[PDB]
Design a binder for this molecule. Structure first.
Ligand SMILES: CCNc1cc2oc3c/c(=[NH+]/CC)c(C)cc-3c(-c3ccccc3C(=O)OCC)c2cc1C
Lengths: 150, 150, 390, 48, 150, 50
């Protein structure tokens, strides 16, 4: 219990000495046990889905709770959770004069949640009758929405 | 600034998904407010040492820390011991040299509050007001007639 | 008669008593202001200051902070009463103080103000009451859960041997949505970055930097004068700099429309949820109403799940029957004495119940141990009648 | 034989039923010890 | 901020109102209808309760004398005196139980010497429980105090 | 880096749960050492460079 802390709190002093690609990635400190016990297989029979549709649903309904439940060191996922996957075409980038840099910047601007304030804010004028929060930009939901990025 | 739909999946859900592998646990609860504030409570089994129970949740949090907005990162991320009941609510008033319910609120938080929360294992100290800040009230018409932005 | 005086006797955990200090909270309707709730908070403080002089020593009203959460809809007033010596009558006791206060707050008002004794026990364990929570198990939205929550709250009220069920406090207030036309933005020549920090820093606030004030380091905040951010018409006042060195109104790229959202979104165990705070029937008790709520949750739409003396005594007391027989034979060998004492148990207990059934007492914690102490004295009374005679 | 079996507590009602028994269970042992050493001694030393 | 063509200086004061105000205006407190602030001490999960509130000298008494003109302390919502009265009523019961036992001992044993052994037998037993419970970890709790009486 | 290995761009919401947005490329354009020449980069003078 303490042996974990000592190594994980000394790590978090070299954390800003690491690449930001690694910083936004999964840094993990866990209890070691190089041996599985419960390997629960999840298959489909009727409504046929792929070894990627299941892999996502397992990691978006079960996996999150299991690792938490009853002191489980770490939970191994046999596949991957779904992600907004974009497959860039180099010829289609050239015939329009573009780079992956422009693609990333497009998503890092159009696909984001923006903290907008509220009507009748924190310090109001004594006499206001309304207090409502403002909605700005919202993270995109479907593949169609990601397809319509300018 | 952020609304209840923002904090729910840019601060909350980021922490919720990165909250696993903890010894002893019953459940987890969350409240994503429209004021742009979220707080997540995790309840452990009766008799569990709160000293280590704190660490486990706060050192697993600090792996989703770079997965959070920099506005939230520079804001107050806090891990404390829960006790939804006050005991000493010390009122601080003025009689002679009249000051406002903002002049006191600052002085309380700039002379006392800092020491109290530290003194004798106090989970957290509640401030009834706010500490002073360099407040600037921008004028939109005065920004336009000079051609400027926030 | 010993059984009936015990089975019909109601069960509680710990008696709620006067603490010289209590509190009362305020709850305003959808989208209320700080100026609106302060008017109510003022009325609450005064009923204690003019119509409760002999009771209240000091009040402590707070505007914008309830116990469900915080905001311009919430409020609380901390009360400190005069010492028990100067509060002689039962009417000068919290139980009766919080009675006529709630009566006044439910009458000459238009919002929601209560009053309660501080549960000297713990937040949990009220007896004849529960904490229900409705979880979204499938991929259904918050709006879909709301309707299922509405259906759950309706069905329990449709057929209540009754119930007392109400939601946690999600209200559902309208939100002002702004749609920024992305194509129009780059056409007029404005960076999306610039527009976002224009609306964000002006209407919500921005943590710019830190400065030093009288030694101590404090924060620098940027916002705007209230009058320029009060109404939906104030959006047009803000002009943003374009690439061609000229100003662009919000109304050019923006789109104004109202939307229905929730001020707070509860989340139980990594999934969107809504808490239902309900109590058991005025006749029934927990275990009954608890399982008489689980069947209603099972009779709800697909993708909708749920999660939540005591059973303690039936166990504990059984071992109290086994160890007695041993210790009543560890000094008294026969199979005659280990049956002589065994009778004094309900001999005294009948009156223990009788005194609690006659008075306003109930089967609490102190009574449950007041039983075994009586049994301990009853065993003593019996053993001497045996040990001396044997 | 009625107290410590009931002191086998649990849940939130832990210390609640536990503390009460052991407080008087210890007190029983001490009262008995006093009534085995001190009380008999005091009774013999000076009674009438 | 800017220097417009004609050498005209544009300052922050011109485009914006600057004042030393509060960091948060969402919460305002009124002590008996009078503008005020204060500190609401929240317990830590497993703290010493009354000992935390009585962890003093302190707990703000070194802040108590250094206040400017007008600034004064006041005490609403407090636990302290309830503990002070809970012990006092139990200890009063203790003494009352001895005196009332002393009469019944005299009313059956006319020997003044005899109505002394049970009077000086049980005060020792109580302290024994105080010594045993301390060796077990138990405190002078609301229960353990009634346990003495029972 | 983003074409051959992948890039963690941003996070998006899918059926309530927050997931990640990844950018890469169709496999065929990153299979062999000859596929390197297919990628053209923007220069300062507003033209493509192999
Ligand atoms: C009828 C009860 N009589 C008791 C008599 C005892 O005698 C003790 C003698 C010792 N002599 C050394 C040769 C030492 C070290 C510890 C002892 C402890 C003890 C053991 C563990 C933890 C604390 C204590 C303890 O009593 O200390 C707390 C101040 C103890 C405890 C009880 C209950």
């Amino acid at each position: 219990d303490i042996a974990q802390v000592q190594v994980q709190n000394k790590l978090q002093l070299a954390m800003p000495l690491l690449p930001q690609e690694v910083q936004q990635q999964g840094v993990s400190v866990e209890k070691s046990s190089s041996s599985f016990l419960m390997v629960v297989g999840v298959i489909n029979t009727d409504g046929t889905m792929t070894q990627e549709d299941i892999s996502d649903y397992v990691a978006a309904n079960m996996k999150d709770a299991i690792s938490r439940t009853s002191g489980v060191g770490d939970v191994q996922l046999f596949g991957s959770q779904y992600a907004m996957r974009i497959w860039m075409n180099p010829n289609e980038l050239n015939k329009f004069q573009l780079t992956p840099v422009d693609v990333i910047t497009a998503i890092k601007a159009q696909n984001a949640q923006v903290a907008a304030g509220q009507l009748g804010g924190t310090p109001p004028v004594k006499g206001q009758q309304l207090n409502a929060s403002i909605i700005a930009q919202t993270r995109l939901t479907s593949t169609e929405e990601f397809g319509k990025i300018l | 600034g952020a609304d209840a739909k923002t904090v729910q999946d840019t601060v909350t859900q980021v922490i919720e998904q990165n909250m696993n592998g903890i010894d002893n646990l019953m459940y987890m609860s969350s409240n994503s407010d429209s004021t742009g504030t979220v707080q997540i409570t995790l309840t452990f089994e009766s008799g569990t040492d709160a000293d280590i129970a704190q660490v486990q949740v706060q050192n697993k949090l600090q792996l989703a820390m770079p997965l959070l907005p920099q506005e939230v990162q520079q804001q107050g991320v806090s891990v404390e011991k829960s006790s939804s009941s006050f005991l000493m609510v010390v009122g601080v008033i003025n009689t002679d040299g009249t000051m406002t319910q903002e002049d006191i609120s600052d002085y309380v938080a700039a002379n006392m509050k800092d020491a109290i929360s530290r003194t004798s294992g106090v989970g957290d100290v509640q401030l009834f007001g706010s500490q002073y800040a360099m407040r600037i009230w921008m004028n939109p018409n005065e920004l336009n007639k000079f051609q400027l932005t926030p | 008669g010993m059984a009936y005086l015990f089975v019909r006797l109601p069960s509680s955990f710990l008696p709620d008593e006067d603490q010289g200090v209590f509190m009362t909270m305020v709850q305003l309707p959808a989208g209320a202001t700080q100026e609106r709730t302060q008017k109510v908070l003022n009325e609450v403080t005064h009923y204690y200051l003019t119509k409760e002089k002999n009771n209240v020593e000091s009040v402590f009203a707070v505007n914008g902070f309830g116990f469900a959460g915080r905001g311009q809809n919430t409020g609380i007033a901390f009360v400190s009463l005069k010492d028990w010596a100067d509060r002689p009558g039962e009417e000068n006791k919290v139980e009766a103080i919080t009675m006529r206060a709630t009566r006044a707050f439910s009458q000459i008002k238009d919002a929601m103000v209560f009053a309660f004794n501080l549960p000297a026990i713990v937040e949990l364990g009220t007896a004849t009451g529960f904490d229900f929570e409705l979880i979204d198990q499938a991929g259904l939205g918050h709006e879909k859960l709301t309707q299922a929550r509405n259906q759950l709250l309706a069905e329990a009220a449709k057929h209540p041997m009754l119930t007392s069920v109400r939601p946690n406090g999600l209200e559902d207030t309208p939100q002002f949505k702004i749609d920024i036309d992305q194509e129009k933005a780059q056409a007029l020549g404005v960076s999306i970055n610039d527009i976002n920090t224009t609306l964000g820093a002006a209407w919500g606030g921005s943590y710019v930097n830190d400065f030093i004030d009288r030694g101590r380091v404090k924060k620098v905040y940027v916002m705007s004068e209230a009058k320029y951010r009060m109404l939906p018409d104030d959006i047009g006042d803000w002009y943003v700099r374009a690439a061609d060195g000229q100003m662009v109104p919000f109304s050019a790229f923006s789109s104004s429309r109202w939307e229905y959202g929730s001020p707070r979104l509860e989340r139980y165990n990594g999934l969107p949820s809504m808490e239902i705070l309900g109590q058991a029937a005025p006749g029934k008790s927990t275990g009954e109403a608890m399982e008489l709520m689980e069947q209603l949750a099972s009779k709800l739409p697909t993708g909708v799940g749920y999660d939540w003396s005591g059973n303690q005594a039936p166990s504990l007391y059984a071992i109290s029957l086994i160890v007695v027989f041993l210790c009543l034979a560890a000094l008294y060998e026969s199979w005659s004495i280990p049956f002589s004492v065994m009778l004094v148990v309900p001999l005294g207990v009948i009156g223990a119940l009788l005194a609690a059934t006659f008075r306003g007492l109930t089967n609490d914690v102190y009574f449950q141990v007041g039983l075994l102490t009586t049994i301990g004295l009853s065993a003593k009374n019996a053993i001497l009648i045996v040990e001396f005679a044997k | 034989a009625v107290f410590v079996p009931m002191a086998f507590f649990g849940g939130s009602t832990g210390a609640i039923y536990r503390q009460f028994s052991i407080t008087i269970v210890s007190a029983m042992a001490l009262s008995v010890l006093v009534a085995l050493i001190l009380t008999p001694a005091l009774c013999a030393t000076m009674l009438k | 901020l800017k220097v417009n063509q004609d050498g005209s200086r544009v300052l922050l004061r011109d485009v914006a109102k600057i004042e030393l105000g509060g960091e948060n205006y969402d919460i305002i407190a009124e002590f008996n209808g009078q503008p005020a602030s204060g500190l609401g001490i929240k317990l830590a999960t497993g703290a010493n309760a009354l000992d935390t509130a009585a962890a003093i000298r302190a707990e703000l008494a070194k802040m108590e004398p250094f206040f400017p003109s007008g600034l004064k302390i006041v005490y609403p919502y407090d636990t302290t005196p309830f503990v002070k009265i809970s012990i006092h009523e139990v200890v009063k019961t203790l003494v009352e139980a001895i005196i009332l036992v002393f009469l019944v001992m005299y009313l059956f044993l006319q020997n003044f010497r005899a109505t002394l052994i049970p009077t000086i037998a049980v005060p020792v037993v109580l302290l024994g429980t105080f010594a045993v419970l301390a060796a077990f970890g138990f405190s002078i709790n609301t229960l353990t105090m009634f346990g003495m009486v029972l």
